[PDB]
Amino acid sequence: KNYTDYFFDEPAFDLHDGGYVPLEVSDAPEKPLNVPPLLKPDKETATDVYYTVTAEAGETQLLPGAKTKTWGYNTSLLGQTIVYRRGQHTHVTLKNTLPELTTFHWHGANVSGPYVDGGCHAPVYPGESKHIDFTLEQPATTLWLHAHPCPSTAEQVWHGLAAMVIVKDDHEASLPLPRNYGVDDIPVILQDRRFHENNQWDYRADYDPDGVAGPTAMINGTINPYFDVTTQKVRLRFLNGANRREWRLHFADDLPFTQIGGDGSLLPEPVKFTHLMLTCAERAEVIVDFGQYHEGDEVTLYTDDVPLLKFRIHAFKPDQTTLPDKLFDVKAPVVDPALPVRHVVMQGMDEGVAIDGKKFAMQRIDATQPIGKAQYWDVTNSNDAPGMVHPFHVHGTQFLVLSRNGHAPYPNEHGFKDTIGVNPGETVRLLVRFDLPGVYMYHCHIIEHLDGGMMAQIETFDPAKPKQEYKLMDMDTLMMALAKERGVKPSEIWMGGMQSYEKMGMK
């Protein structure tokens, strides 16, 4: 069964918005796709690994001309790919060499909150170093790292603070999958940007409370990239790292491809596609087979009508292996019947975005859930048609998708996920279990909605113990710091998201 059409509701696609910015094919000369190097551990044994992850500012040649000023992890733009291993004790030094405070959020990592999680409440101030330790007990998958100050996440991701995280385990290592990182297994971080004069980025001037989208696609920090294919089979780790844009991916000739992984795990079984849509923060790992091409051939990957990435076919050794019927055993957590079904409503667009009738307040806990107890969450997008698809994300968990409007989830949604696109009028039922105590956000992952208040937080707790005290960030602390850091008055700070709060008269 080859899936030839996008699963999401077509009327709600981003391309029907009034302020939709179409992608334009840039002038710049085609060049080799940048593949971020693997971050070298400071030290590694079988049981332990030590990393230093460093947020920093620099400049990057993106367009011919001047260099674009950028932020990155251990590099000028984006980051070096970080490798974690299930069961391995991980030690990370978070180092901020930026002019402003930041946060290090491990999107999709089953870690304690709110500090290791690295959300709103885990500031790392300029010049400061912080130490975190954790052991991941979750399946092999593609995660990512990104800035998460509340606000502005949108500004820091725009400036380039995102990096791929690969999680390895024993089960995945036993499978006949391409796995030579940089040769037949590559990141495909999908982003867009708007270049101004001097090829600079200017988030404020491009700002839009409903989502910032620029006309120039940028793949792993590359304009008009090509990839030299030297194997028959190639594994693409797609990440939608855009502020808002949806990617509607397909190849020339309707070349099929097989999705083998989603956000939080391998899919139970491989799923064949010709067309695949990804909302913000979603990952899809796919295998593309170039067996039916000759050397010299060129194969174009598209989003809608726009070429993104060209694959140049070189000589390759024939690959005889085929995927097994079942890739991964999904073990569903059990739900206590005594628990309520949690109902979470996403509402509004533009400056009016909200969850359950209110915007995020960094001091206010919106919900609680005992650890180790799975609960059904019904997540609804209140928008009426046309509306937009909101990608709903929950920190600190990987959930299963049980249903969409009482019917089957999409074909590629039978594994573990941390982000799900919710269509106008739709209720998605999720099975959500938190393994660790802490404070965790849940929010739309259109990053301007996130900053604009479409976010809430849940305290997970051990019932055996009393309520734990967490030092939560407050808005005065954040603005004091940004004021000092930017060398300006607390009253003349500008942050992405402020406009949403102020226009709605909310704090």
Q: Give yes or no for residue 233 binding Cu ion (CB under 5 A).
A: no
Map residue 323 onto helix, strand or coil.
coil
Mask for 334-373, x = binds Cu ion (CB under 5 A): ----------------------------------------
Q: Please give the single-letter amino acid code of residue 153.
A: T
The nearer residue to Cu ion, 248 or 283, going by C-beta atoms, is 283
Residue 257 CB, shortest distance to Cu ion, in Å, is 25
Number of residues that bind Cu ion (CB under 5 A): 8
Q: Which stretch binds Cu ion (CB under 5 A): 54-62, 269-277, 286-294, 393-401?
A: 393-401
Residue closer to Cu ion by CB (options 63, 188) is 188
Q: Are strands 105-107 and 141-146 parallel, antiparallel or unpaired?
A: antiparallel
* Pick 121 or 449: Cβ nearer Cu ion: 449
Q: How far is the CB of 56 from Cu ion (least distance, A)?
A: 20
Residue 12 vs 260, nearer CB to Cu ion: 12
The yes or no reply on residue 444 touching Cu ion (CB under 5 A) is yes
Q: Which of 431, 446, 456, 481 binds Cu ion (CB under 5 A)?
A: 446
Site string for Cu ion, 112-151 (x = CB under 5 A): ----------------------------------------
Task: Indicate which single residue of 193, 245, 283, 395 sits in contact with Cu ion (rule: CB under 5 A).
Answer: 395
Pick between residue 280 and residue 287 the one whose CB is nearest to Cu ion: 280
Residue number, 219 or 450, with CB nearest to Cu ion? 450
Q: What whole-number distance in Å separates Cα of residue 400 and Cα of residue 404?
A: 12
Residue nearest to Cu ion (CB): 444
Q: Which of 390, 404, 417, 433 binds Cu ion (CB under 5 A)?
A: 390
Report the C-alpha gap between 326 and 140 in whole angstroms: 15
Give the Cα separation of 80 and 458 in Å (integer).
Answer: 31
C-beta of 60 vs 103, nearer to Cu ion: 103
Q: By CB under 5 A, which span of 71-79, 122-130, 286-294, 443-451 interacts with Cu ion?
A: 443-451
Min separation Cβ 184 and Cu ion, Å? 27
* Nearer CB in complex with Cu ion: 239/441: 441
Site for Cu ion in 242-281 (CB under 5 A): 281
- How far, in Å, CA of 5 to CA of 7, rounded? 6
**Distance of alpha carbon 241 from alpha carbon 278, whole angstroms:** 10
The span of 5-13, 70-78, 440-448, 462-470 binding Cu ion (CB under 5 A) equals 440-448
Query: Which residues, in sequence order, are bridge partners of residue 145?
Result: 106, 163
Phi, psi of 490 (to 5 degrees): -45, -30
| Rounded-to-integer distance, Cα 378 and Cα 123, Å | 31
- Contacts to Cu ion from residues 280-319, by CB under 5 A: 281
Among 138, 449, 460, 482, binds Cu ion (CB under 5 A): 449
Shortest distance in whole angstroms from residue 445 CB to Cu ion: 6
Q: Does residue 83 bind Cu ion (CB under 5 A)?
A: no
CA distances (Å), origin 163, targets 348, 403, 502: 30, 31, 32
Residues in the chain, how many? 507
- DSSP letter for each residue of 5-23: S-SS-GGGSGGGSTT----
* Shortest Cβ 306–Cu ion spacing (Å): 23
Minimum Å gap between C-beta 450 and Cu ion is 7
| Of residues 303, 187, 304, the one with CA closest to residue 238 | 187
Residues contacting residue 465 through CB under 8 Å, at least 6 positions apart: none
Smallest distance from Cu ion to CB 441, Å: 5
Which of 446, 478 has the CB closer to Cu ion? Answer: 446
What is the secondary structure of 450-487 as a DSSP string? Answer: HHTT-EEEEEEE-TTSPPPP-----HHHHHHHHHHHHT
* Pairing of the two strands 438-444 and 455-461: antiparallel
435 to each of 112, 336, 374, 398, 438, how far by Cα in Å?
9, 15, 9, 10, 10
Touching Cu ion, residues 158-217 (CB under 5 A): none
- Residue 460 amino acid letter: T
Site for Cu ion in 95-114 (CB under 5 A): 107
C-alpha span between 298 and 287 (Å, rounded): 17
Distance CA 55, CA 124 (A): 10
Give contact residues for Cu ion (rule: CB under 5 A). Answer: 107, 281, 390, 395, 441, 444, 446, 449
